Design a binder for this molecule. Sequence first.
Ligand SMILES: CCCS(=O)(=O)Nc1ccc(F)c(-n2cc(-c3cncnc3)c3nc(N(C)C4CCN(CC)CC4)ccc32)c1F
Ligand SMILES: OC[C@H]1O[C@H](O)[C@H](O)[C@@H](O)[C@@H]1O
Length: 261
Amino acid sequence: DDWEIPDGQITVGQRIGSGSFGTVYKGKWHGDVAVKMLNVTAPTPQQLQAFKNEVGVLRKTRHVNILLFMGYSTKPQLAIVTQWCEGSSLYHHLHASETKFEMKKLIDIARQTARGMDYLHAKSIIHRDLKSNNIFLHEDNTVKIGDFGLATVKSRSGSILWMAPEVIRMQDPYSFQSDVYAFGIVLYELMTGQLPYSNINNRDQIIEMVGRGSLSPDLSKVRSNCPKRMKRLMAECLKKKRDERPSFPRILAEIEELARE
Ligand SMILES: CCCS(=O)(=O)Nc1ccc(F)c(-n2cc(-c3cncnc3)c3nc(N(C)C4CCN(CC)CC4)ccc32)c1F
Ligand SMILES: OC[C@H]1O[C@H](O)[C@H](O)[C@@H](O)[C@@H]1O
């Protein structure tokens, strides 16, 4: 219950990232921690509630593949405290760093992401923005799912590649099934090494054609050593009709089975 950290206990160190909604620092509190402070000094009334309702969501997560919530500050600023992870995100490894993981490692990353998502969904928490940027590889080995965006307040733009067709349409939207689609696009990333729609020049073009059903990822680009179970699972996860997509228990059980072989 006492997840509030009193004023003065945290030594806020180097600034690690900055956006409109928030700023993230490395800091000291019984060891290393990350501290995301919200860029709003005078808190608007019941925006504090939005901070409180998130704190009440993060408070419910205890799992090795979910970034460890550790506490929060109200004074001096509104702030959220997590564990400090050494390493970088799946997005950085795959698309910036040119990291070439072995298939065993690639499946292991897909496995651990599945575990974390399965856990979240089992607690009725919908992520809403699962993507390779939000999967941190701690020690470059352990998946730590979080939400590393500092641009916007969490809906509850640079995520369109992972958005399900119904989520792009906004006809009413976000659901377990939409999270599962995003995971589909992560498997694509892992198994091809590339972002989807690499040939398409324009975002508005991706929004239009994925929304109007006329564009989908090129599944033939998967590595020649991509298992058959995974290409099939990827395709089930990417299905246009929401209700045709599998749930995480069966996704996890399928990936755990393919890892064993
Ligand atoms: C319990 C889940 C809470 S959550 O949804 O993940 N939100 C959240 C709350 C508090 C936080 F501090 C955090 N949070 C934690 C970390 C972090 C952790 N370990 C180690 N480096 C960075 C973090 N990096 C962010 N970036 C955008 C950084 C990602 C790494 N890059 C390297 C070039 C610098 C920018 C944004 C929020 C971040 C958060 F993401
Ligand atoms: O607020 C919902 C949050 O649920 C979990 O803690 C996820 O790890 C995080 O990414 C998400 O933002």
